[PDB]
Enzyme design. Sequence first.
Site, PDB file in Angstrom:
ATOM      1  N   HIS A  61       0.753  -1.323   0.137  1.00 37.80           N
ATOM      2  CA  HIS A  61      -0.146   0.084   0.070  1.00 37.80           C
ATOM      3  C   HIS A  61       0.930   1.429   0.109  1.00 37.80           C
ATOM      4  O   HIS A  61       0.444   2.294  -0.490  1.00 37.80           O
ATOM      5  CB  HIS A  61      -0.812   0.109   1.185  1.00 37.80           C
ATOM      6  CG  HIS A  61      -1.960  -1.241   1.338  1.00 37.80           C
ATOM      7  ND1 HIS A  61      -2.770  -1.678   0.443  1.00 37.80           N
ATOM      8  CD2 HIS A  61      -1.567  -2.425   2.235  1.00 37.80           C
ATOM      9  CE1 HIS A  61      -3.155  -2.702   0.895  1.00 37.80           C
ATOM     10  NE2 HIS A  61      -2.517  -3.278   1.798  1.00 37.80           N
ATOM     11  N   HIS A  91       6.095   6.892   6.186  1.00 38.39           N
ATOM     12  CA  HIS A  91       5.832   6.420   4.764  1.00 38.39           C
ATOM     13  C   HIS A  91       5.124   7.460   4.138  1.00 38.39           C
ATOM     14  O   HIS A  91       4.985   8.958   4.803  1.00 38.39           O
ATOM     15  CB  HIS A  91       4.804   5.383   4.792  1.00 38.39           C
ATOM     16  CG  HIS A  91       3.587   5.832   5.535  1.00 38.39           C
ATOM     17  ND1 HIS A  91       3.405   5.769   6.944  1.00 38.39           N
ATOM     18  CD2 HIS A  91       2.256   6.143   5.080  1.00 38.39           C
ATOM     19  CE1 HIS A  91       2.198   6.137   7.208  1.00 38.39           C
ATOM     20  NE2 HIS A  91       1.401   6.321   6.281  1.00 38.39           N
ATOM     21  N   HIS A  93       2.220   9.069   1.002  1.00 38.09           N
ATOM     22  CA  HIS A  93       0.908   8.941   0.061  1.00 38.09           C
ATOM     23  C   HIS A  93       1.100   9.890  -0.923  1.00 38.09           C
ATOM     24  O   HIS A  93       1.541  10.833  -1.019  1.00 38.09           O
ATOM     25  CB  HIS A  93      -0.225   9.083   0.898  1.00 38.09           C
ATOM     26  CG  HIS A  93      -0.513   8.322   2.125  1.00 38.09           C
ATOM     27  ND1 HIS A  93      -1.170   7.363   2.093  1.00 38.09           N
ATOM     28  CD2 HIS A  93      -0.168   8.550   3.186  1.00 38.09           C
ATOM     29  CE1 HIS A  93      -1.372   6.805   3.300  1.00 38.09           C
ATOM     30  NE2 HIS A  93      -0.708   7.667   4.076  1.00 38.09           N
ATOM     31  N   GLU A 103      -3.303  13.278   1.451  1.00 42.39           N
ATOM     32  CA  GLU A 103      -4.513  12.791   2.189  1.00 42.39           C
ATOM     33  C   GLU A 103      -5.289  14.253   2.499  1.00 42.39           C
ATOM     34  O   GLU A 103      -6.255  14.333   2.505  1.00 42.39           O
ATOM     35  CB  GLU A 103      -4.269  11.957   3.239  1.00 42.39           C
ATOM     36  CG  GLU A 103      -3.692  10.734   2.404  1.00 42.39           C
ATOM     37  CD  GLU A 103      -3.821   9.252   3.202  1.00 42.39           C
ATOM     38  OE1 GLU A 103      -3.220   9.212   4.523  1.00 42.39           O
ATOM     39  OE2 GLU A 103      -4.184   8.328   2.606  1.00 42.39           O
ATOM     40  N   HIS A 116       3.914  11.005   6.378  1.00 42.45           N
ATOM     41  CA  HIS A 116       3.423  10.499   7.785  1.00 42.45           C
ATOM     42  C   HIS A 116       4.314   9.895   8.587  1.00 42.45           C
ATOM     43  O   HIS A 116       5.177   9.048   8.429  1.00 42.45           O
ATOM     44  CB  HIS A 116       2.374   9.497   7.613  1.00 42.45           C
ATOM     45  CG  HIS A 116       1.203  10.162   7.027  1.00 42.45           C
ATOM     46  ND1 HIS A 116       0.039   9.462   6.463  1.00 42.45           N
ATOM     47  CD2 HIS A 116       0.458  11.503   6.952  1.00 42.45           C
ATOM     48  CE1 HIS A 116      -0.795  10.284   6.125  1.00 42.45           C
ATOM     49  NE2 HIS A 116      -0.495  11.602   6.347  1.00 42.45           N
ATOM     50  N   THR A 195      -5.393   6.456   8.397  1.00 45.91           N
ATOM     51  CA  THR A 195      -6.165   6.703   6.972  1.00 45.91           C
ATOM     52  C   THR A 195      -6.176   5.669   5.973  1.00 45.91           C
ATOM     53  O   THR A 195      -6.469   5.402   5.102  1.00 45.91           O
ATOM     54  CB  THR A 195      -5.211   7.864   6.275  1.00 45.91           C
ATOM     55  OG1 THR A 195      -4.067   7.340   5.990  1.00 45.91           O
ATOM     56  CG2 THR A 195      -5.234   8.937   7.003  1.00 45.91           C
TER      57      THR A 195
HETATM   58  N1  LIG Z   1      -1.577   6.505   7.016  1.00 46.46           N
HETATM   59  S1  LIG Z   1      -1.391   6.641   8.863  1.00 46.46           S
HETATM   60  O1  LIG Z   1      -2.887   7.329   9.438  1.00 46.46           O
HETATM   61  O2  LIG Z   1      -0.124   7.478   9.146  1.00 46.46           O
HETATM   62  C1  LIG Z   1      -1.047   4.993   9.385  1.00 46.46           C
HETATM   63  C2  LIG Z   1      -0.295   4.699  10.231  1.00 46.46           C
HETATM   64  C3  LIG Z   1      -0.042   3.737  10.558  1.00 46.46           C
HETATM   65  C4  LIG Z   1      -0.392   2.403  10.188  1.00 46.46           C
HETATM   66  N2  LIG Z   1      -0.174   1.103  10.610  1.00 46.46           N
HETATM   67  C5  LIG Z   1      -1.072  -0.023  10.620  1.00 46.46           C
HETATM   68  O3  LIG Z   1      -2.312  -0.131  10.225  1.00 46.46           O
HETATM   69  N3  LIG Z   1      -0.483  -1.397  11.269  1.00 46.46           N
HETATM   70  C6  LIG Z   1      -1.149  -2.601  11.152  1.00 46.46           C
HETATM   71  C7  LIG Z   1      -1.009  -3.100  12.447  1.00 46.46           C
HETATM   72  C8  LIG Z   1      -1.854  -2.203  13.622  1.00 46.46           C
HETATM   73  C9  LIG Z   1      -3.280  -2.044  13.185  1.00 46.46           C
HETATM   74  O4  LIG Z   1      -3.794  -3.202  13.844  1.00 46.46           O
HETATM   75  C10 LIG Z   1      -1.662   2.511   9.561  1.00 46.46           C
HETATM   76  C11 LIG Z   1      -1.916   3.893   8.858  1.00 46.46           C
HETATM   77 ZN   LIG Z   2      -0.153   7.494   6.021  1.00 45.84          ZN
END
Ligand SMILES: NS(=O)(=O)c1ccc(NC(=O)NCCCCO)cc1
Ligand SMILES: [Zn+2]
Length: 257
Positions: A61, A91, A93, A103, A116, A195
């Site tokens: 992703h 990371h 986007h 975003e 982020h 997100t």
């Molecule tokens: N784009 S964001 O809001 O900065 C973000 C940051 C970390 C994560 N990490 C994540 O989903 N890890 C999967 C394991 C923990 C969730 O159960 C997802 C989105």
């Molecule tokens: Zn992010």
Amino acid sequence: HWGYGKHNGPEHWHKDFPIAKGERQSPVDIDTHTAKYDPSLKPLSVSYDQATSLRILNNGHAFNVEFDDSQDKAVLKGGPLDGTYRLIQFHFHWGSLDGQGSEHTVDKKKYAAELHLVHWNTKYGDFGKAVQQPDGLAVLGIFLKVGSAKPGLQKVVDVLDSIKTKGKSADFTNFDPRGLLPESLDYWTYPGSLTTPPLLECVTWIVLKEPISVSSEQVLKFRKLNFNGEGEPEELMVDNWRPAQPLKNRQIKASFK
Ligand SMILES: NS(=O)(=O)c1ccc(NC(=O)NCCCCO)cc1
Ligand SMILES: [Zn+2]
Ligand SMILES: NS(=O)(=O)c1ccc(NC(=O)NCCCCO)cc1
């Protein structure tokens, strides 16, 4: 599973992750005129001098630059936050075109990409427990616009050829995330969510006012990555952003006037 295509993109996520329609979802449009200046907001404290990057991973992703978060080596404090938050990964986007990719939006303006820097609240012991808490994460969001190159991004750009496809990882030590910061740490802040699925409502968002500029060649190299695994049909990793979600019963606060 979920993704950013026609059949699995953000408009579909609610079918497996019903919190997608929740009360504090991210990202949002930042209406700069209705954000309220809060003089009680403290300046952000970014302490990245001892950061230890370990590896870079294409997770299908985005790509994550991962850090050693087993000690207080790279921490975010102050701002709207109570306590200490440890950097676990960053990371981005980004878009298929320079005109989109962020975003968060600023008065509906989309930036070419958004960085982020993800941090978790040390009072919860690890990232997995922190995401289950309403104050578990602090994500520092930084907009990227296309213009002059960002020298501190180039080491990221140059390793992407080694992690083209989903599941590939590469050693990525000694990267300094301070090379990705703008000059000013003025910010907006609001309570929101991850997100991407699972879209958990655990994030204090801190979005910097000042974008960084990256070159067209730098962002072009992001667009050469693949969502798919090696040996699967190639789909370019582009437009991996969720659009702005309803602000609902939230107020965005500004650290500046
Ligand atoms: N784009 S964001 O809001 O900065 C973000 C940051 C970390 C994560 N990490 C994540 O989903 N890890 C999967 C394991 C923990 C969730 O159960 C997802 C989105
Ligand atoms: Zn992010
Ligand atoms: N709610 S969600 O997480 O966005 C989602 C959307 C589609 C699907 N599954 C799906 O599309 N399966 C069929 C794939 C055919 C393409 O080869 C799974 C989850």
